[PDB]
Design a protein around this motif. Structure first.
Motif, PDB file in Angstrom:
ATOM      1  N   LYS A   1      47.451  32.391  56.340  1.00  0.00           N
ATOM      2  CA  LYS A   1      46.587  31.596  57.377  1.00  0.00           C
ATOM      3  C   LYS A   1      45.357  31.729  57.779  1.00  0.00           C
ATOM      4  CE  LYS A   1      48.937  34.326  61.315  1.00  0.00           C
ATOM      5  NZ  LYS A   1      50.124  34.925  60.618  1.00  0.00           N
ATOM      6  N   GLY A   2      45.065  33.179  57.624  1.00  0.00           N
ATOM      7  CA  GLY A   2      43.533  33.299  57.624  1.00  0.00           C
ATOM      8  C   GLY A   2      42.802  32.701  56.448  1.00  0.00           C
ATOM      9  N   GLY A   3      43.184  32.760  55.339  1.00  0.00           N
ATOM     10  CA  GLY A   3      42.556  32.314  54.220  1.00  0.00           C
ATOM     11  C   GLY A   3      43.117  32.835  53.011  1.00  0.00           C
ATOM     12  N   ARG A   4      42.053  33.232  51.891  1.00  0.00           N
ATOM     13  CA  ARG A   4      42.286  33.633  50.642  1.00  0.00           C
ATOM     14  C   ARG A   4      42.256  35.055  50.613  1.00  0.00           C
ATOM     15  NH1 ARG A   4      38.289  29.515  46.978  1.00  0.00           N
ATOM     16  NH2 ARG A   4      38.859  27.724  48.021  1.00  0.00           N
ATOM     17  N   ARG A   5      43.172  36.095  50.260  1.00  0.00           N
ATOM     18  CA  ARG A   5      43.115  37.307  50.410  1.00  0.00           C
ATOM     19  C   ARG A   5      43.077  37.983  48.860  1.00  0.00           C
ATOM     20  NH1 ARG A   5      41.866  40.408  52.398  1.00  0.00           N
ATOM     21  NH2 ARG A   5      43.380  41.946  53.703  1.00  0.00           N
ATOM     22  N   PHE A   6      41.843  38.409  48.466  1.00  0.00           N
ATOM     23  CA  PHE A   6      41.588  38.891  46.952  1.00  0.00           C
ATOM     24  C   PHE A   6      41.774  40.071  46.700  1.00  0.00           C
ATOM     25  CE2 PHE A   6      38.289  35.455  48.177  1.00  0.00           C
ATOM     26  CZ  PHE A   6      38.798  34.582  47.267  1.00  0.00           C
ATOM     27  N   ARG A   7      42.800  40.323  45.500  1.00  0.00           N
ATOM     28  CA  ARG A   7      42.954  41.601  44.543  1.00  0.00           C
ATOM     29  C   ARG A   7      42.196  41.455  43.304  1.00  0.00           C
ATOM     30  NH1 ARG A   7      49.271  43.233  45.374  1.00  0.00           N
ATOM     31  NH2 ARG A   7      49.569  41.212  44.232  1.00  0.00           N
ATOM     32  N   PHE A   8      42.130  42.653  42.729  1.00  0.00           N
ATOM     33  CA  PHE A   8      41.707  42.571  41.264  1.00  0.00           C
ATOM     34  C   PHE A   8      42.902  43.202  40.256  1.00  0.00           C
ATOM     35  CE2 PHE A   8      37.942  42.788  43.848  1.00  0.00           C
ATOM     36  CZ  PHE A   8      37.038  41.947  42.796  1.00  0.00           C
ATOM     37  N   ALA A   9      43.157  42.635  39.260  1.00  0.00           N
ATOM     38  CA  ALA A   9      44.195  42.907  38.164  1.00  0.00           C
ATOM     39  C   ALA A   9      43.619  43.332  37.134  1.00  0.00           C
ATOM     40  CB  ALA A   9      44.964  41.674  38.012  1.00  0.00           C
ATOM     41  N   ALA A  10      43.183  44.614  36.808  1.00  0.00           N
ATOM     42  CA  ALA A  10      42.764  45.155  35.441  1.00  0.00           C
ATOM     43  C   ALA A  10      43.697  45.324  34.387  1.00  0.00           C
ATOM     44  CB  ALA A  10      42.180  46.309  35.834  1.00  0.00           C
ATOM     45  N   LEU A  11      43.241  45.125  33.299  1.00  0.00           N
ATOM     46  CA  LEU A  11      44.089  45.201  31.966  1.00  0.00           C
ATOM     47  C   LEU A  11      43.383  46.164  31.034  1.00  0.00           C
ATOM     48  CD1 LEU A  11      46.536  43.878  30.241  1.00  0.00           C
ATOM     49  CD2 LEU A  11      44.678  42.465  29.428  1.00  0.00           C
ATOM     50  N   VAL A  12      44.074  47.383  30.728  1.00  0.00           N
ATOM     51  CA  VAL A  12      43.418  48.535  30.001  1.00  0.00           C
ATOM     52  C   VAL A  12      44.321  48.759  29.124  1.00  0.00           C
ATOM     53  CG1 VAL A  12      42.949  50.908  30.233  1.00  0.00           C
ATOM     54  CG2 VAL A  12      41.966  49.449  31.952  1.00  0.00           C
ATOM     55  N   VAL A  13      43.847  48.869  27.571  1.00  0.00           N
ATOM     56  CA  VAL A  13      44.462  49.356  26.594  1.00  0.00           C
ATOM     57  C   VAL A  13      43.968  50.772  26.327  1.00  0.00           C
ATOM     58  CG1 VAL A  13      44.364  49.265  24.000  1.00  0.00           C
ATOM     59  CG2 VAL A  13      44.647  47.240  25.482  1.00  0.00           C
ATOM     60  N   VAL A  14      45.115  51.682  26.115  1.00  0.00           N
ATOM     61  CA  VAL A  14      44.666  53.229  25.995  1.00  0.00           C
ATOM     62  C   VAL A  14      45.358  53.756  24.711  1.00  0.00           C
ATOM     63  CG1 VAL A  14      46.663  54.187  27.044  1.00  0.00           C
ATOM     64  CG2 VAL A  14      44.582  55.353  27.048  1.00  0.00           C
ATOM     65  N   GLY A  15      44.575  54.619  23.990  1.00  0.00           N
ATOM     66  CA  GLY A  15      45.246  55.207  22.571  1.00  0.00           C
ATOM     67  C   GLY A  15      44.583  56.320  22.072  1.00  0.00           C
ATOM     68  N   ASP A  16      45.410  57.235  20.934  1.00  0.00           N
ATOM     69  CA  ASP A  16      44.701  58.258  20.287  1.00  0.00           C
ATOM     70  C   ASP A  16      43.570  58.121  19.558  1.00  0.00           C
ATOM     71  OD1 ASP A  16      47.045  59.472  21.453  1.00  0.00           O
ATOM     72  OD2 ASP A  16      47.789  59.625  19.284  1.00  0.00           O
ATOM     73  N   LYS A  17      43.231  56.593  18.939  1.00  0.00           N
ATOM     74  CA  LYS A  17      42.530  56.421  17.701  1.00  0.00           C
ATOM     75  C   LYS A  17      43.435  57.040  16.582  1.00  0.00           C
ATOM     76  CE  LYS A  17      38.453  55.384  18.672  1.00  0.00           C
ATOM     77  NZ  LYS A  17      37.667  54.357  19.296  1.00  0.00           N
ATOM     78  N   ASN A  18      44.661  57.290  16.610  1.00  0.00           N
ATOM     79  CA  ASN A  18      45.512  57.972  15.679  1.00  0.00           C
ATOM     80  C   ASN A  18      47.090  57.611  15.955  1.00  0.00           C
ATOM     81  OD1 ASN A  18      43.756  59.953  13.930  1.00  0.00           O
ATOM     82  ND2 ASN A  18      43.171  60.682  16.066  1.00  0.00           N
ATOM     83  N   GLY A  19      47.351  56.456  15.836  1.00  0.00           N
ATOM     84  CA  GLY A  19      48.787  55.994  15.581  1.00  0.00           C
ATOM     85  C   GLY A  19      49.308  55.722  17.073  1.00  0.00           C
ATOM     86  N   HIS A  20      48.725  55.890  18.022  1.00  0.00           N
ATOM     87  CA  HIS A  20      49.353  55.695  19.468  1.00  0.00           C
ATOM     88  C   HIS A  20      48.352  54.837  20.297  1.00  0.00           C
ATOM     89  CE1 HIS A  20      51.707  59.436  18.456  1.00  0.00           C
ATOM     90  NE2 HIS A  20      52.449  58.634  18.412  1.00  0.00           N
ATOM     91  N   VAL A  21      49.035  53.832  20.809  1.00  0.00           N
ATOM     92  CA  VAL A  21      48.236  52.933  21.601  1.00  0.00           C
ATOM     93  C   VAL A  21      49.295  52.275  22.831  1.00  0.00           C
ATOM     94  CG1 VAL A  21      48.554  50.970  20.078  1.00  0.00           C
ATOM     95  CG2 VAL A  21      46.740  50.957  21.656  1.00  0.00           C
ATOM     96  N   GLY A  22      48.829  52.137  24.189  1.00  0.00           N
ATOM     97  CA  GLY A  22      49.549  51.821  25.129  1.00  0.00           C
ATOM     98  C   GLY A  22      49.040  50.559  25.778  1.00  0.00           C
ATOM     99  N   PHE A  23      50.033  49.766  26.586  1.00  0.00           N
ATOM    100  CA  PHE A  23      49.758  48.465  26.915  1.00  0.00           C
ATOM    101  C   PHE A  23      48.853  48.330  28.349  1.00  0.00           C
ATOM    102  CE2 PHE A  23      51.777  44.977  29.582  1.00  0.00           C
ATOM    103  CZ  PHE A  23      51.339  43.870  28.871  1.00  0.00           C
ATOM    104  N   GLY A  24      49.343  48.879  29.588  1.00  0.00           N
ATOM    105  CA  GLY A  24      48.588  49.060  30.784  1.00  0.00           C
ATOM    106  C   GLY A  24      48.894  47.575  31.529  1.00  0.00           C
ATOM    107  N   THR A  25      48.880  47.805  32.799  1.00  0.00           N
ATOM    108  CA  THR A  25      48.835  46.510  33.640  1.00  0.00           C
ATOM    109  C   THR A  25      47.810  46.417  34.740  1.00  0.00           C
ATOM    110  OG1 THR A  25      50.681  45.272  34.833  1.00  0.00           O
ATOM    111  CG2 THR A  25      51.023  47.510  34.818  1.00  0.00           C
ATOM    112  N   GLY A  26      47.888  47.372  35.516  1.00  0.00           N
ATOM    113  CA  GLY A  26      46.925  47.499  36.591  1.00  0.00           C
ATOM    114  C   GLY A  26      47.203  47.020  38.033  1.00  0.00           C
ATOM    115  N   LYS A  27      48.504  46.722  38.212  1.00  0.00           N
ATOM    116  CA  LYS A  27      49.210  46.900  39.333  1.00  0.00           C
ATOM    117  C   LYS A  27      48.446  46.006  40.432  1.00  0.00           C
ATOM    118  CE  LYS A  27      52.760  48.910  39.757  1.00  0.00           C
ATOM    119  NZ  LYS A  27      52.518  48.184  41.034  1.00  0.00           N
ATOM    120  N   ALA A  28      47.706  44.810  39.989  1.00  0.00           N
ATOM    121  CA  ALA A  28      46.848  44.031  40.817  1.00  0.00           C
ATOM    122  C   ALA A  28      46.099  44.994  41.819  1.00  0.00           C
ATOM    123  CB  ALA A  28      47.620  43.087  41.383  1.00  0.00           C
TER     124      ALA A  28
END
Length: 158
Positions: free
Chosen positions: A18-45
């Motif tokens: 009712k006040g207006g627009r309330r803003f959050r940031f949703a970050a998306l981050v890849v993470v990995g070894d550089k050696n066979g392992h890598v991860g999705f990541g979400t950022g929980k808004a």
RNA sequence: GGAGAGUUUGAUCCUGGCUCAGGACGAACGCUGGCGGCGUGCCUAAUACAUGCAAGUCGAGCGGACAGAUGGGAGC
């Protein structure tokens, strides 16, 4: 493991009140070894650290490993998630990581150095590239297939 | 041997067009302009054209004029 993290995107999202627009940031981050392992990541808004924490869990939950015959994947595979469609195609040596934007991030931190990759639908489409890298692990290198079939490695390949 | 991005929403995913980064050219136009080496130069009116020049050669086919004069002649 020794993880490196890469920030794919940070989109400002909004809920209306009712006040207006309330803003959050949703970050998306890849993470990995550089050696066979890598991860999705979400950022929980909220923030990048929140993204990293979930990424580093998903590396070991989802992509238990990225199969790698040399500096490339074992076979050609089409990763599909929703309207995500990535072609991941094994290259020769010295080819490079030929891929677009979010796809590059995954394959770089997976440690893949030689791959051809076309996107057939686009919008932070890491889930689709994740499903393919798992689909390689369905028929990784040749050890599983041979063991699964009931064959040798040189019997299977030639 | 194959890279994407922006743009519909308050925010979203999708569908879907639009736009952009690349390369190419017989190019034209601006503004600007030093030299060199290769290449290219009526894509329009197969429109009309002043002027010149662009297919002539063989005298060992050829009679013939018109020359030639080695010499004799030649008035002087």
């Amino acid at each position: 493991l020794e993880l490196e993290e890469r920030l794919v995107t940070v989109n400002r999202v909004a809920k209306v009140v009712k006040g207006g627009r309330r803003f959050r940031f949703a970050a998306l981050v890849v993470v990995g070894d550089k050696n066979g392992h890598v991860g999705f990541g979400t950022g929980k808004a909220q923030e990048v650290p929140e993204a990293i924490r979930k990424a580093v869990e998903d590396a070991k939950k989802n992509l238990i490993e990225v199969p790698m015959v040399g500096t490339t994947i074992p076979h050609e595979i089409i990763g599909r998630f929703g309207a995500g469609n990535i072609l991941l195609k094994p290259a020769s040596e010295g080819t490079g990581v030929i891929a677009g934007g979010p796809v590059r991030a995954v394959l770089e931190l997976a440690g893949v150095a030689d791959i051809l990759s076309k996107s057939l639908g686009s919008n932070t489409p890491i889930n689709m590239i994740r499903a393919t890298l798992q689909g390689l692990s369905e028929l990784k290198r040749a050890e599983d297939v041979a063991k699964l079939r009931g064959k040798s490695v040189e019997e299977l390949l030639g």
